[PDB]
mmCIF file of C-alpha atoms in Angstrom:
data_model
loop_
_atom_site.group_PDB
_atom_site.id
_atom_site.type_symbol
_atom_site.label_atom_id
_atom_site.label_comp_id
_atom_site.label_asym_id
_atom_site.label_seq_id
_atom_site.Cartn_x
_atom_site.Cartn_y
_atom_site.Cartn_z
ATOM 1 C CA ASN A 1 -1.556 -19.676 -132.551
ATOM 2 C CA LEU A 2 -1.651 -17.335 -135.549
ATOM 3 C CA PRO A 3 -4.036 -14.553 -134.435
ATOM 4 C CA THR A 4 -2.296 -11.422 -133.129
ATOM 5 C CA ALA A 5 -3.005 -10.052 -129.649
ATOM 6 C CA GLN A 6 -5.482 -7.574 -131.140
ATOM 7 C CA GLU A 7 -7.201 -10.293 -133.156
ATOM 8 C CA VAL A 8 -7.454 -12.369 -129.984
ATOM 9 C CA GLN A 9 -9.170 -9.499 -128.178
ATOM 10 C CA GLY A 10 -11.573 -9.204 -131.073
ATOM 11 C CA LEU A 11 -12.301 -12.930 -131.244
ATOM 12 C CA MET A 12 -12.884 -13.207 -127.518
ATOM 13 C CA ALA A 13 -15.056 -10.067 -127.375
ATOM 14 C CA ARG A 14 -17.054 -11.552 -130.248
ATOM 15 C CA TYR A 15 -17.477 -14.807 -128.339
ATOM 16 C CA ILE A 16 -19.064 -12.929 -125.407
ATOM 17 C CA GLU A 17 -21.410 -11.081 -127.783
ATOM 18 C CA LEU A 18 -22.610 -14.348 -129.321
ATOM 19 C CA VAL A 19 -23.170 -15.879 -125.887
ATOM 20 C CA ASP A 20 -25.063 -12.733 -124.940
ATOM 21 C CA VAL A 21 -27.353 -12.993 -127.985
ATOM 22 C CA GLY A 22 -27.645 -16.757 -127.610
ATOM 23 C CA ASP A 23 -26.518 -17.797 -131.097
ATOM 24 C CA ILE A 24 -25.402 -21.367 -130.427
ATOM 25 C CA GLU A 25 -24.672 -22.136 -134.061
ATOM 26 C CA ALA A 26 -22.429 -19.076 -134.395
ATOM 27 C CA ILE A 27 -20.625 -19.900 -131.131
ATOM 28 C CA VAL A 28 -20.007 -23.504 -132.170
ATOM 29 C CA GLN A 29 -18.579 -22.284 -135.500
ATOM 30 C CA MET A 30 -15.848 -20.464 -133.578
ATOM 31 C CA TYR A 31 -14.354 -23.786 -132.471
ATOM 32 C CA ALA A 32 -11.893 -26.052 -134.278
ATOM 33 C CA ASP A 33 -12.670 -29.721 -134.985
ATOM 34 C CA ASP A 34 -10.393 -30.958 -132.217
ATOM 35 C CA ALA A 35 -11.353 -28.229 -129.746
ATOM 36 C CA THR A 36 -11.885 -29.057 -126.072
ATOM 37 C CA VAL A 37 -14.087 -27.319 -123.522
ATOM 38 C CA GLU A 38 -13.418 -27.464 -119.762
ATOM 39 C CA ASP A 39 -16.230 -25.574 -118.080
ATOM 40 C CA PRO A 40 -15.955 -25.356 -115.203
ATOM 41 C CA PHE A 41 -12.209 -26.001 -115.314
ATOM 42 C CA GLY A 42 -11.526 -29.046 -113.167
ATOM 43 C CA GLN A 43 -14.307 -30.947 -114.944
ATOM 44 C CA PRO A 44 -13.604 -33.496 -117.709
ATOM 45 C CA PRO A 45 -12.829 -32.028 -121.172
ATOM 46 C CA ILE A 46 -15.660 -31.946 -123.713
ATOM 47 C CA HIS A 47 -14.589 -32.702 -127.282
ATOM 48 C CA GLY A 48 -16.395 -33.202 -130.575
ATOM 49 C CA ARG A 49 -18.552 -30.552 -132.241
ATOM 50 C CA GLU A 50 -21.846 -32.351 -131.623
ATOM 51 C CA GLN A 51 -20.841 -32.525 -127.953
ATOM 52 C CA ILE A 52 -19.756 -28.888 -127.780
ATOM 53 C CA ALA A 53 -22.986 -27.842 -129.522
ATOM 54 C CA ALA A 54 -25.006 -29.902 -127.044
ATOM 55 C CA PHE A 55 -23.051 -28.233 -124.231
ATOM 56 C CA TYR A 56 -24.110 -24.748 -125.351
ATOM 57 C CA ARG A 57 -27.682 -25.853 -126.006
ATOM 58 C CA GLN A 58 -28.226 -26.979 -122.411
ATOM 59 C CA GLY A 59 -26.654 -23.775 -121.150
ATOM 60 C CA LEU A 60 -28.111 -21.147 -123.479
ATOM 61 C CA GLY A 61 -31.043 -23.051 -124.970
ATOM 62 C CA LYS A 62 -32.632 -15.701 -121.339
ATOM 63 C CA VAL A 63 -28.943 -15.920 -120.448
ATOM 64 C CA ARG A 64 -27.061 -12.620 -120.661
ATOM 65 C CA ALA A 65 -23.297 -12.060 -120.647
ATOM 66 C CA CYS A 66 -20.932 -9.098 -120.588
ATOM 67 C CA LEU A 67 -17.242 -8.317 -120.291
ATOM 68 C CA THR A 68 -16.368 -7.004 -116.850
ATOM 69 C CA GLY A 69 -12.847 -6.027 -117.850
ATOM 70 C CA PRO A 70 -10.613 -5.873 -120.947
ATOM 71 C CA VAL A 71 -9.339 -8.958 -122.741
ATOM 72 C CA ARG A 72 -5.774 -9.907 -121.822
ATOM 73 C CA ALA A 73 -4.039 -11.265 -124.931
ATOM 74 C CA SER A 74 -0.631 -12.815 -125.588
ATOM 75 C CA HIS A 75 1.503 -13.002 -128.716
ATOM 76 C CA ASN A 76 1.104 -16.753 -129.067
ATOM 77 C CA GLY A 77 -2.586 -16.842 -129.989
ATOM 78 C CA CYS A 78 -3.925 -17.076 -126.436
ATOM 79 C CA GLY A 79 -6.126 -14.802 -124.334
ATOM 80 C CA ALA A 80 -7.972 -14.465 -121.024
ATOM 81 C CA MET A 81 -11.014 -12.355 -120.181
ATOM 82 C CA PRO A 82 -13.237 -11.612 -117.158
ATOM 83 C CA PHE A 83 -17.027 -11.579 -117.493
ATOM 84 C CA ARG A 84 -20.341 -11.995 -115.719
ATOM 85 C CA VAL A 85 -23.201 -14.283 -116.681
ATOM 86 C CA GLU A 86 -26.830 -13.605 -115.810
ATOM 87 C CA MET A 87 -28.972 -16.723 -115.693
ATOM 88 C CA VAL A 88 -31.514 -18.601 -113.608
ATOM 89 C CA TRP A 89 -30.814 -21.085 -110.831
ATOM 90 C CA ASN A 90 -33.155 -22.916 -108.463
ATOM 91 C CA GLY A 91 -35.822 -20.956 -110.306
ATOM 92 C CA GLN A 92 -34.334 -17.592 -109.367
ATOM 93 C CA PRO A 93 -32.228 -14.873 -111.075
ATOM 94 C CA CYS A 94 -28.510 -15.100 -110.328
ATOM 95 C CA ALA A 95 -25.118 -13.822 -111.432
ATOM 96 C CA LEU A 96 -21.935 -15.812 -112.061
ATOM 97 C CA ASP A 97 -18.437 -14.330 -112.292
ATOM 98 C CA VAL A 98 -16.164 -16.141 -114.733
ATOM 99 C CA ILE A 99 -12.761 -15.878 -116.400
ATOM 100 C CA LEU A 100 -12.295 -17.510 -119.796
ATOM 101 C CA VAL A 101 -8.896 -18.620 -121.079
ATOM 102 C CA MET A 102 -8.724 -19.612 -124.761
ATOM 103 C CA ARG A 103 -6.053 -20.837 -127.126
ATOM 104 C CA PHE A 104 -6.790 -20.116 -130.776
ATOM 105 C CA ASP A 105 -5.321 -21.977 -133.711
ATOM 106 C CA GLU A 106 -3.565 -21.042 -136.935
ATOM 107 C CA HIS A 107 -7.018 -20.673 -138.488
ATOM 108 C CA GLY A 108 -8.359 -18.265 -135.879
ATOM 109 C CA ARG A 109 -10.539 -20.971 -134.336
ATOM 110 C CA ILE A 110 -10.758 -21.978 -130.680
ATOM 111 C CA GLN A 111 -8.460 -24.904 -129.900
ATOM 112 C CA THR A 112 -9.014 -24.923 -126.124
ATOM 113 C CA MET A 113 -11.526 -23.160 -123.881
ATOM 114 C CA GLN A 114 -11.097 -23.133 -120.106
ATOM 115 C CA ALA A 115 -13.634 -21.365 -117.886
ATOM 116 C CA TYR A 116 -12.648 -20.797 -114.261
ATOM 117 C CA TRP A 117 -15.428 -20.498 -111.696
ATOM 118 C CA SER A 118 -17.046 -22.315 -108.789
ATOM 119 C CA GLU A 119 -19.951 -21.953 -106.377
ATOM 120 C CA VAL A 120 -18.122 -19.057 -104.689
ATOM 121 C CA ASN A 121 -18.513 -17.056 -107.899
ATOM 122 C CA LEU A 122 -22.287 -17.451 -107.845
ATOM 123 C CA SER A 123 -24.652 -14.824 -106.460
ATOM 124 C CA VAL A 124 -28.419 -15.294 -106.190
ATOM 125 C CA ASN B 1 -4.366 -29.213 -105.646
ATOM 126 C CA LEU B 2 -5.114 -29.332 -101.916
ATOM 127 C CA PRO B 3 -6.377 -25.755 -101.402
ATOM 128 C CA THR B 4 -10.185 -25.584 -101.521
ATOM 129 C CA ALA B 5 -11.916 -23.004 -103.743
ATOM 130 C CA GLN B 6 -12.240 -20.637 -100.777
ATOM 131 C CA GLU B 7 -8.574 -21.134 -99.860
ATOM 132 C CA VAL B 8 -7.504 -20.534 -103.445
ATOM 133 C CA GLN B 9 -9.355 -17.216 -103.293
ATOM 134 C CA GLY B 10 -7.495 -16.370 -100.093
ATOM 135 C CA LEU B 11 -4.084 -17.390 -101.434
ATOM 136 C CA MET B 12 -4.486 -15.448 -104.650
ATOM 137 C CA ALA B 13 -5.816 -12.368 -102.856
ATOM 138 C CA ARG B 14 -2.793 -12.479 -100.560
ATOM 139 C CA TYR B 15 -0.470 -12.716 -103.567
ATOM 140 C CA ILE B 16 -1.779 -9.416 -104.953
ATOM 141 C CA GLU B 17 -1.198 -7.871 -101.516
ATOM 142 C CA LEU B 18 2.417 -9.079 -101.437
ATOM 143 C CA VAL B 19 3.010 -7.607 -104.888
ATOM 144 C CA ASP B 20 1.302 -4.407 -103.764
ATOM 145 C CA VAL B 21 3.657 -3.981 -100.778
ATOM 146 C CA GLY B 22 6.583 -5.475 -102.690
ATOM 147 C CA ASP B 23 7.557 -8.263 -100.307
ATOM 148 C CA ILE B 24 9.614 -10.262 -102.800
ATOM 149 C CA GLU B 25 10.777 -12.931 -100.352
ATOM 150 C CA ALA B 26 7.236 -13.565 -99.116
ATOM 151 C CA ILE B 27 6.065 -13.831 -102.728
ATOM 152 C CA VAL B 28 8.804 -16.356 -103.412
ATOM 153 C CA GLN B 29 7.818 -18.464 -100.405
ATOM 154 C CA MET B 30 4.242 -18.745 -101.721
ATOM 155 C CA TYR B 31 5.670 -20.669 -104.685
ATOM 156 C CA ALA B 32 6.641 -24.332 -104.626
ATOM 157 C CA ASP B 33 10.445 -24.695 -104.485
ATOM 158 C CA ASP B 34 10.311 -25.944 -108.078
ATOM 159 C CA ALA B 35 7.456 -23.800 -109.415
ATOM 160 C CA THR B 36 7.228 -22.413 -112.933
ATOM 161 C CA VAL B 37 6.329 -18.870 -113.959
ATOM 162 C CA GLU B 38 5.287 -17.678 -117.409
ATOM 163 C CA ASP B 39 4.960 -13.907 -117.307
ATOM 164 C CA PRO B 40 3.800 -12.846 -119.798
ATOM 165 C CA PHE B 41 2.327 -16.109 -121.078
ATOM 166 C CA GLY B 42 3.909 -16.939 -124.424
ATOM 167 C CA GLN B 43 7.349 -16.342 -122.948
ATOM 168 C CA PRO B 44 9.730 -19.140 -121.809
ATOM 169 C CA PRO B 45 8.908 -20.521 -118.328
ATOM 170 C CA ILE B 46 11.306 -19.684 -115.509
ATOM 171 C CA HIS B 47 12.060 -22.537 -113.100
ATOM 172 C CA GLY B 48 12.578 -22.652 -109.338
ATOM 173 C CA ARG B 49 12.513 -20.110 -106.523
ATOM 174 C CA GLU B 50 15.981 -18.749 -107.331
ATOM 175 C CA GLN B 51 14.979 -17.836 -110.893
ATOM 176 C CA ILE B 52 11.570 -16.624 -109.718
ATOM 177 C CA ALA B 53 13.134 -14.489 -106.968
ATOM 178 C CA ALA B 54 15.436 -12.825 -109.504
ATOM 179 C CA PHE B 55 12.449 -12.313 -111.808
ATOM 180 C CA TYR B 56 10.417 -10.564 -109.106
ATOM 181 C CA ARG B 57 13.373 -8.513 -107.885
ATOM 182 C CA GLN B 58 13.883 -7.209 -111.418
ATOM 183 C CA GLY B 59 10.226 -6.194 -111.551
ATOM 184 C CA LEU B 60 9.533 -4.944 -108.022
ATOM 185 C CA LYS B 61 7.339 1.868 -106.822
ATOM 186 C CA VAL B 62 4.529 -0.449 -107.926
ATOM 187 C CA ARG B 63 0.860 -0.628 -106.968
ATOM 188 C CA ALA B 64 -1.391 -3.652 -107.551
ATOM 189 C CA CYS B 65 -4.954 -4.556 -106.662
ATOM 190 C CA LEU B 66 -7.714 -6.937 -107.701
ATOM 191 C CA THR B 67 -10.124 -5.500 -110.257
ATOM 192 C CA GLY B 68 -12.554 -8.377 -109.869
ATOM 193 C CA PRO B 69 -13.193 -11.442 -107.723
ATOM 194 C CA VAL B 70 -10.962 -14.494 -107.828
ATOM 195 C CA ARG B 71 -12.394 -17.398 -109.842
ATOM 196 C CA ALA B 72 -11.456 -20.678 -108.128
ATOM 197 C CA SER B 73 -11.809 -24.314 -109.156
ATOM 198 C CA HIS B 74 -12.267 -27.423 -107.035
ATOM 199 C CA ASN B 75 -8.896 -28.813 -108.053
ATOM 200 C CA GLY B 76 -6.605 -26.214 -106.494
ATOM 201 C CA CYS B 77 -6.652 -23.823 -109.439
ATOM 202 C CA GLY B 78 -7.753 -20.259 -109.926
ATOM 203 C CA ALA B 79 -7.679 -17.137 -112.055
ATOM 204 C CA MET B 80 -7.979 -13.477 -111.106
ATOM 205 C CA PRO B 81 -8.105 -10.088 -112.854
ATOM 206 C CA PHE B 82 -5.886 -7.295 -111.496
ATOM 207 C CA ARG B 83 -4.120 -4.050 -112.407
ATOM 208 C CA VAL B 84 -0.580 -2.872 -111.736
ATOM 209 C CA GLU B 85 0.499 0.762 -111.490
ATOM 210 C CA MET B 86 4.175 1.363 -112.137
ATOM 211 C CA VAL B 87 6.531 4.079 -113.347
ATOM 212 C CA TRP B 88 8.167 4.234 -116.761
ATOM 213 C CA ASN B 89 10.518 7.088 -117.658
ATOM 214 C CA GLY B 90 9.382 8.817 -114.485
ATOM 215 C CA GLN B 91 5.904 8.519 -116.002
ATOM 216 C CA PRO B 92 3.020 6.673 -114.287
ATOM 217 C CA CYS B 93 1.474 3.851 -116.331
ATOM 218 C CA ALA B 94 -0.953 0.993 -115.735
ATOM 219 C CA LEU B 95 -1.111 -2.646 -116.818
ATOM 220 C CA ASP B 96 -4.230 -4.839 -116.800
ATOM 221 C CA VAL B 97 -3.481 -8.509 -116.112
ATOM 222 C CA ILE B 98 -5.107 -11.892 -115.495
ATOM 223 C CA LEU B 99 -3.189 -14.537 -113.537
ATOM 224 C CA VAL B 100 -3.883 -18.253 -113.591
ATOM 225 C CA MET B 101 -2.501 -20.432 -110.824
ATOM 226 C CA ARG B 102 -2.336 -24.092 -109.887
ATOM 227 C CA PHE B 103 -1.426 -24.847 -106.271
ATOM 228 C CA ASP B 104 0.036 -28.134 -104.991
ATOM 229 C CA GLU B 105 -1.000 -30.394 -102.118
ATOM 230 C CA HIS B 106 0.948 -28.086 -99.809
ATOM 231 C CA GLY B 107 -0.929 -24.915 -100.684
ATOM 232 C CA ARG B 108 2.017 -23.656 -102.697
ATOM 233 C CA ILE B 109 1.912 -22.254 -106.224
ATOM 234 C CA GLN B 110 3.133 -24.947 -108.618
ATOM 235 C CA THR B 111 2.505 -22.960 -111.805
ATOM 236 C CA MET B 112 1.619 -19.358 -112.582
ATOM 237 C CA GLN B 113 0.696 -17.839 -115.941
ATOM 238 C CA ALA B 114 0.163 -14.117 -116.444
ATOM 239 C CA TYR B 115 -1.863 -13.097 -119.498
ATOM 240 C CA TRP B 116 -1.174 -9.646 -120.917
ATOM 241 C CA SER B 117 0.443 -7.754 -123.773
ATOM 242 C CA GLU B 118 1.438 -4.182 -124.519
ATOM 243 C CA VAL B 119 -2.174 -3.597 -125.619
ATOM 244 C CA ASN B 120 -3.186 -3.952 -121.945
ATOM 245 C CA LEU B 121 -0.705 -1.227 -121.052
ATOM 246 C CA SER B 122 -1.780 2.386 -120.563
ATOM 247 C CA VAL B 123 0.761 5.122 -119.836
#
């Protein structure tokens, strides 16, 4: 938890940009070795780089993503941000509203990623 | 973690409304008798309804509303984006915030964490 609030905002805005462009390798590089992903939150934690990379490959491997509000950062290396994801479901264009909560480490890398959303946040 | 995703959305929407009207006691009742509040996150947690009541009384002359839909989980958790309009030095300012909540088997808030810093403030 070394990054300042402003650095958190930058790191999280960057994350959205990478998701939006679909650079899986760049996204995976943002994580720390022991990082965990809970997406959607409530689902078992995903750990291990190979696993996290596989997670993003099945998700991003025409997906678009944008911030729908400013990043909310803390002074202990954590942040939360609202965004919308455009993808395809059941063979049809849809939109998903999500809120990502991340904890960064002393190296500026993602230690924990928690994405809140459910079926109610989906719109076809 | 009893509230369903839809219920979570309803509970969290109602919370914003209580803050908007400033009903401190009704806000306090939404919390579990032994709930924890971290506001802003990064700060020491406050424990129990007595401490939480004092916390909200100190804070709540204030306007609050959702700025986006509530994102709910299937395990009684949720997160929502909202803004608060308050007065500072007789001057009107705004604060952008994102709250994360975990409700218990009784539909009461067990834990609440508000993410924000002075960089989300706009006077």
